[PDB]
Symmetry: D2
Subunit: 341 residues, 4 copies
């Protein structure tokens, strides 16, 4: 009774067969993961910029966004390592649309086989055009379908404390950022990095769709993300305090700052103020900052229904023009940080 | 490449074949779930008491504990509905032993097939002798191996905000309690009840060990568990405030109070003080209280290595004598509440 | 031990997702099966003609063959029910190429996943143009990949006596012809119809690639195929004797005659002689004949290597010109049989 | 639609977990296989004697039979290599009971999971007491459940010509005997050896119950079994003709003779007469003979319903006293053949 239906799911290998990773995508992913690892461990001083839509609901608008962003990725490549946000899985406060995978037709039909196909296809097209991709890993089974095409992964604020999410991260091939908790707790993200760096044994699902025991090796390229709590936590004093806590736990004291969510108090117009503060830190010193996150789309704001093209149906985003402004600000500031060497 | 090995896992059907649920277990589970549902919705005024070890590491001692507890379950049955804690999965702050399923030989061999077998076998013997069982559902795959034998489930403080745990709960056949967050946030637990009461579509693993899309019906019997935060939250004034919030979200305002963890501040001896405060609430009014949780074993305290029989290797528990005292206290207090009707 | 390796196999559902059966193919298949069932039980007097290549080794040629045969299928539709031979699985006397599924690139690479995909795709294109398809079911696992597209099936002379093939036939949705044995034993085909008409329990593999127990309903539309032994068995006397045996076993006394294999002494130039004999039987009486089988391709003969387009690499076939002749012979003869209403 | 239901099947790993092969069973199987291989290729001149019930329908009687046979296996070990017949799969002419796996309760309930469990359990008890085991491999999926416990396999007369059976044999770790066809055709057995000695790619089912592509290495230890046809084929003249044909095909000219089935025809006691003829051949020369097959039980004859203990419900068997006599005859004769070294 509590389970109304069990439905057919295609295993990852079906999608892999139709959409094998190309040589060029495979090289881009490999390189971008190493370049990000370098930032995490303080070997390079470019700023990782994870930027793009709160959520992907329309592949067409995503590829249009990617095309515009790719120009800026290239233009700023000596200062910034730009990776697009390509988020397919959304955690809700209670209920709501959980993302393109879970319900790609945006109407309660839950066509997950289509969703996974469409996700893999978009990620392959992105990597093929030269745009690497990032996503939040929320589900335990979906990652086998597309993790080979992801250069950087997030664990959400709502799952940073979760032991199964820490286990998942311990087996991912990409670097992973763990967000502080929804009321501001940083210690859980520091503890997550500790957990995810270790080997684990746990149950998962293979590429062929069958359950198995997996033994992971640990992920050495995890870091923390500052995304606000009851109050914002992006400023120099908060960064300095986090770095101190990170060092005391013996993990990397390089961290990423989210300009959106609780750092902008859920007002997309405040993302630019955050980025201005970060720019000012980078100009002064800013040695503990390795990255920033930005919720950005073609058109600003949000809507309940997907009426307007290139506008978020989840958290409100800045628009394109404001995106060019914010990237130019961050690239100018980091150029100065990098020259201080 | 961050995956060191993938190992063979027996599907649930293998364990179900060797250990089918008996008529008597099945009847006990079905009726205990309905009895608890009645407490969650305020139809009955007995107190649900979830009591037993922080963790199971030794089935033999668990059965000895269960035989003692069964006499009290019977004695107090008009005032208390006593259900044993049989927790096979432990969330750690960073790393550590994750419980009997994950590493039943307590030595880092991760014999999960044996662990699942042993979990199911203990649960079946418990239900067969008349003692119903409760556990924390932490892993997404393990529950198909033994959920049929569980009368009440917990979602931990660290995972209440996790969407995949809310989805799990929405498909469970037992009532589920959601703990408030580790620093005291209640809202996430109230939100979880909202989420878990609804229907979801998500990926899970069948009894045959294959991935599938599952469509759940929603769980109408979820409630909150007060387990402390930065400060304890067990007293009347916290109960009253939680009840108000619960009513404002339109969900059940009957809740459970954990005498252990952050409500005792990690001093097991304080579980009795908490239970005394609860008793005084039940005596004065206590209409919003439907249950208590208690970490109890044969022998009090804790130890790092499993040297002493019937003594915890995880959180410190009260011993058997203090357990008899606490249950007498709660039964006398509730008998008065119940007479007020 | 003596297994050199185990390799990844996509389950049927992967192929069904990429190549769903169309409305029109589904209607054609349903219709053709009922029409054939009518022949098997003597409800209609058209002649079923199973005609085409010994084996498919080039889908392009097969589609060209089909487009030609389609014009004859339409032209003769009141006298003949023409169904194309689309055989993907070949039994060898010892070793040799086992067909397009087993080794589609014809070079010992055994790309079975490609082979299955290609088989399904050809079958679907055939049914979509209006040509129904027939095949030999030799393998126990391959049928789930394409049986939905097959209007008539054979069990080979080498497998008619095999219990696992009889079981298979008992669960197929198409009519099935059982060949007499390689030395001329007819009793095993009669026994096979008996067996295949009954319900069975046995092990098989689901559409999802998992082993299971299947309980079949029996196949009421089975019949015998006369294909020679030590000596040919196509003549009136053999037909009369077979009919008698069939009636004595209580099964349908309508049978099919193969013009090729041991009835032509493995000499493709002899197929026309057999068809002439059959025509003479239809002209005299021929009441126990419901069908013929013919090995036919664009170009006559055979070759060891696939050098010449539209020429067999297995048993030698008659060419297109000889095919037009044979069909016109059979249609003229059956028109007369049918007019004796 | 012609599938009335699909039912749950435990994979081999479930049975392997409850009944792992012991060290002693594993040593016995390994040793027996090699010893049989030595017979097949003429390195040792003991006679393989495959002896026991036509079919196993009662594990208790089978173990009692094995305890009696063991004493003779030991007594005759320098002359004879005695292996018990433990046949769980039976090919029927049309329909009938297909053996203990397919329907263990002998009542049309088709409890295959119980049947596979019982089969494995008996085979393990037999190997543990020191009695090695032989069986006919008829089904494609069942072997994974118990082949590890089999020292010699047969392919039946009915399936010798079947390509999927030849494939199966190519992947078996035991020596395999192929029977001549039901009407006496020896060539198909000789062709089967050729086939089974080669490497093949085909679809099969893994120990975890999932379909896969398998690549076999070929079985170098196959041989022919003379089991009669239109006429018996056990005498010196038939053996000499078979040896010649075997040598002309370039395979082993050491063969086995079945005393039962079409060699003894309608009189099971004629098995003794066949064995007397074989003994006389061994005394005279008999260089091409490497083994015999005998259908033998505690009690002679056969019955339709399993009313008498230790009596066949399939083909009629000689009784225990005749079994002692036949073994003594064969051992005395072979002792003389061997002394002519
Ligand atoms: Mn967002
Ligand atoms: Mn605890
Ligand atoms: Mn042919
Ligand atoms: Mn027999």
């Amino acid at each position: 009774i509590k389970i109304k239906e069990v439905k057919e799911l295609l295993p990852p290998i079906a999608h892999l067969y139709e959409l094998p990773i190309s040589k060029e995508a495979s090289g881009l992913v490999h390189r971008t993961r190493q370049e990000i690892s370098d930032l995490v461990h303080g070997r390079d001083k470019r700023l990782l910029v994870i930027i793009g839509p709160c959520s992907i609901h329309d592949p067409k608008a995503a590829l249009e966004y990617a095309e515009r962003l790719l120009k800026l990725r290239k233009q700023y490549e000596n200062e910034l390592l730009i990776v697009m946000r390509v988020y397919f899985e959304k955690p809700r406060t209670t209920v709501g649309w959980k993302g393109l995978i879970n319900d790609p037709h945006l109407d309660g039909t839950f066509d997950i086989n289509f969703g996974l196909r469409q996700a893999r296809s978009l990620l392959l097209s992105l990597n093929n055009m030269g745009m690497p991709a990032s996503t939040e890993f929320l589900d335990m089974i979906t990652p086998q379908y597309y993790a080979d095409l992801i250069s950087w992964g997030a664990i959400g604020a709502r799952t940073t404390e979760s032991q199964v999410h820490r286990e998942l991260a311990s087996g991912l091939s990409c670097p992973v950022g763990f967000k502080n908790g929804t009321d501001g707790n940083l210690k859980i993200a520091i503890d997550a990095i500790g957990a995810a760096s270790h080997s684990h044994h746990f149950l998962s699902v293979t590429k062929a769709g069958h359950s198995a025991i997996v033994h992971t090796g640990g992920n050495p390229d995890c870091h923390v993300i500052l995304r606000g709590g009851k109050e914002p936590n992006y400023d120099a004093e908060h960064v300095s305090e986090a770095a101190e806590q990170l060092r005391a736990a013996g993990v990397t004291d390089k961290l990423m700052i989210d300009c959106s969510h609780a750092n902008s108090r859920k007002d997309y117009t405040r993302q630019m103020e955050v980025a201005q503060d970060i720019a000012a830190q980078l100009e002064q010193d800013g040695g503990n900052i390795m990255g920033v996150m930005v919720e950005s789309h073609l058109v600003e704001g949000r809507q309940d229904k997907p009426e307007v093209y290139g506008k978020s149906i989840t958290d409100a985003c800045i628009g394109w023009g404001a995106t060019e402004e914010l990237l130019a600000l961050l690239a100018g500031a980091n150029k100065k940080r990098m020259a201080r060497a």
